[PDB]
Design a protein around this ligand. Structure first.
Ligand SMILES: [Zn+2]
Length: 216
């Protein structure tokens, strides 16, 4: 079935610039059939950049999961032909390190707090920091330092972050750690993440704690 806008970022291979035919249009929407521009959802913001040197402001998906690229100059595009794609690599790559960071934080937390003794409740990330909302009885702070040293240690050692599909479902995994059902864009190796720049703990309420992490 090709009625689904083929995606390239899932195959990323870190490809920065892309080129693919063009499909229908809306007010600002620009349905396509090729793209390196990651839509949204899963806590990983829509990376950005330029499509034909044009300004991309929003990038999401439709019910059938069709990537629409909300641009600034919609009055410079037809309705069928072909175009070039350019994405803010850095803003992208610095998101992968972050997103891949969170998965590692998941394992690390398992090791330190004990797999089972805590519950992930919320997630998501900004362009600079990442957030992991959790539900754990003890005031996390008493683990700040043990967590960071462990996060980093794994980093240095590095490890392959393999990814795959099992039909219409995509799974990911770091080394021999947790196998996660995430749907974002990850680095190929965690050594490509970097040590923690800062790990702030805060109480979000209802007894839920929030780990915000920053990378060097
Ligand atoms: Zn995730």
């Amino acid at each position: 079935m090709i009625n689904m806008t083929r995606k390239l970022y899932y195959e990323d291979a870190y490809l920065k610039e892309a080129k693919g035919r063009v499909l229908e249009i809306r007010d600002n929407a620009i349905l396509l059939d090729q793209t390196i521009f990651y839509p949204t959802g899963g806590g990983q913001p829509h990376d950005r950049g330029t499509i034909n040197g044009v300004e991309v402001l929003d990038v999401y998906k439709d019910e059938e999961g069709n990537v629409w690229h909300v641009v600034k100059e919609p009055e410079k595009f037809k309705v069928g032909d072909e175009v070039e794609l350019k994405i803010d690599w850095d803003y992208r790559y610095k998101l992968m390190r972050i997103h891949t960071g969170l998965h590692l934080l998941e394992h690390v937390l398992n090791e330190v707090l004990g797999e089972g003794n805590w519950q992930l409740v919320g997630s998501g990330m900004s362009v600079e920091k990442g957030r992991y909302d959790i539900a754990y009885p003890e005031n996390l702070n008493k683990y700040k330092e043990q967590i960071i040293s462990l996060f980093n240690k794994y980093v240095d050692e590095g490890g392959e972050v393999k990814i795959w599909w099992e039909g219409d479902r995509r799974y990911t995994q770091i080394r021999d750690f947790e196998v996660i059902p995430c749907g974002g864009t990850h680095v190929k190796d965690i050594k490509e993440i970097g040590h923690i720049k800062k790990l702030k703990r805060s109480s979000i309420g209802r007894g839920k704690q929030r780990l915000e992490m920053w990378l060097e």
